[PDB]
Design a protein around this motif. Structure first.
Motif, PDB file in Angstrom:
ATOM      1  N   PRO A  64       0.765  -1.330  -0.053  1.00 51.33           N
ATOM      2  CA  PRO A  64      -0.038   0.241  -0.044  1.00 51.33           C
ATOM      3  C   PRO A  64       0.831   1.237   0.002  1.00 51.33           C
ATOM      4  CG  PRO A  64      -1.069  -1.554   1.568  1.00 51.33           C
ATOM      5  CD  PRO A  64       0.328  -2.148   0.958  1.00 51.33           C
ATOM      6  N   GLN A  65       1.916   1.357   0.619  1.00 50.32           N
ATOM      7  CA  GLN A  65       2.679   2.591   0.514  1.00 50.32           C
ATOM      8  C   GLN A  65       3.552   3.001  -0.643  1.00 50.32           C
ATOM      9  OE1 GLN A  65       5.344   0.633   4.136  1.00 50.32           O
ATOM     10  NE2 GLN A  65       5.076   2.848   4.605  1.00 50.32           N
ATOM     11  N   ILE A  66       3.239   2.011  -1.587  1.00 48.72           N
ATOM     12  CA  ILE A  66       3.636   2.373  -2.929  1.00 48.72           C
ATOM     13  C   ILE A  66       2.492   2.462  -3.906  1.00 48.72           C
ATOM     14  CG2 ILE A  66       6.199   1.630  -2.500  1.00 48.72           C
ATOM     15  CD1 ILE A  66       5.553  -0.709  -4.523  1.00 48.72           C
ATOM     16  N   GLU A 109       7.541   4.934  17.236  1.00 50.66           N
ATOM     17  CA  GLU A 109       7.632   4.219  15.611  1.00 50.66           C
ATOM     18  C   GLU A 109       8.138   5.463  14.829  1.00 50.66           C
ATOM     19  OE1 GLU A 109       5.123   0.840  15.081  1.00 50.66           O
ATOM     20  OE2 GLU A 109       5.470   0.038  16.762  1.00 50.66           O
ATOM     21  N   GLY A 110       8.370   5.165  13.721  1.00 50.65           N
ATOM     22  CA  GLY A 110       8.420   5.820  12.281  1.00 50.65           C
ATOM     23  C   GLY A 110       7.883   5.238  11.149  1.00 50.65           C
ATOM     24  N   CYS A 111       7.870   5.877  10.300  1.00 49.28           N
ATOM     25  CA  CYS A 111       7.082   5.411   8.828  1.00 49.28           C
ATOM     26  C   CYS A 111       7.544   6.157   7.756  1.00 49.28           C
ATOM     27  CB  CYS A 111       5.629   5.280   9.131  1.00 49.28           C
ATOM     28  SG  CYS A 111       4.432   4.721   8.038  1.00 49.28           S
ATOM     29  N   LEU A 112       8.011   5.643   6.812  1.00 49.68           N
ATOM     30  CA  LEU A 112       8.408   6.130   5.468  1.00 49.68           C
ATOM     31  C   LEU A 112       7.377   7.124   4.907  1.00 49.68           C
ATOM     32  CD1 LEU A 112      11.175   5.248   5.125  1.00 49.68           C
ATOM     33  CD2 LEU A 112      10.273   3.017   4.315  1.00 49.68           C
TER      34      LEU A 112
HETATM   35 NI    NI Z   1       5.129   2.179   8.060  1.00 49.76          NI
END
Ligand code: NI
Ligand SMILES: O=C(CSC(=O)[C@H](Cc1ccccc1)CC(F)(F)F)c1ccccc1
Ligand code: NI
Length: 183
Positions: A64-66, A109-112
């Motif tokens: 989903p992130q792309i 946390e992180g996220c691109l």
């Molecule tokens: Ni993420």
């Protein structure tokens, strides 16, 4: 190769959808994107290649992130002390069981896909079992604890339209749950 240009950002509708299960075998096209996702992680973790192409460092990525709303993920978590490393491309991953015991990263946390840093503890299961398929449709069962388990849960959440920050207490973001372990 994929770059940060390919990674959609918080606010994009695809991130809030539920991703579709894949039929097996995968299309030549689906295999290609899953390899490319893994290649993004590898590339983002190389000092040189990441400077050159402006890559944020990552250890996991969900399709989903792309902006591909399909249930596939990649996880690349290097050796980091113990002799354990996690290099997995998974199709239709599912958490079939877990611990009651929660765990958390003490820095959050992180996220691109999230341009800002968000403070807050994201409590997660300390242990999980995952059943999934690999790229060639063979069967994979994973038993994970601690950092690896957090990472996989994070990426799996992406397939369900859940973002890390949804799990953060609005009132007491840095308050650990009793008996939650710090990782
Ligand atoms: Ni993420
Ligand atoms: O923190 C990261 C990478 S951040 C990350 O992988 C994101 C998610 C994440 C999961 C769990 C904890 C922190 C961040 C991936 C995303 F955005 F694609 F989903 C790191 C990279 C190389 C060496 C040491 C640390
Ligand atoms: Ni809470």
């Amino acid at each position: 190769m994929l770059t940060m240009k390919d990674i959609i950002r918080d606010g994009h509708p695809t991130l809030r959808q539920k991703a579709a299960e894949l039929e097996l075998p995968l299309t030549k096209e689906e295999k290609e994107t899953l390899i490319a996702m893994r290649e993004f992680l590898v590339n983002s973790q190389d000092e040189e290649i990441a400077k050159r192409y402006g890559l944020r460092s990552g250890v996991g990525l969900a399709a989903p992130q792309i902006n591909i709303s399909k249930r596939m993920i990649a996880v690349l978590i290097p050796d980091d002390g113990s002799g354990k490393s996690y290099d997995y491309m998974l199709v239709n991953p599912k958490i079939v069981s877990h611990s009651v015991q929660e765990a958390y990263l003490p820095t959050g946390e992180g996220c691109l896909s999230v341009d800002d840093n968000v403070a807050g503890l994201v409590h997660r299961h300390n242990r999980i079992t995952i059943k999934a398929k690999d790229i060639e449709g063979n069967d994979i069962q994973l038993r994970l604890k601690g950092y690896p388990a957090i990472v996989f849960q994070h990426e799996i959440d992406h397939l369900n339209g859940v973002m890390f920050y949804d799990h953060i207490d609005k009132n007491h973001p840095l308050q650990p749950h009793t008996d939650a372990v710090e990782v």
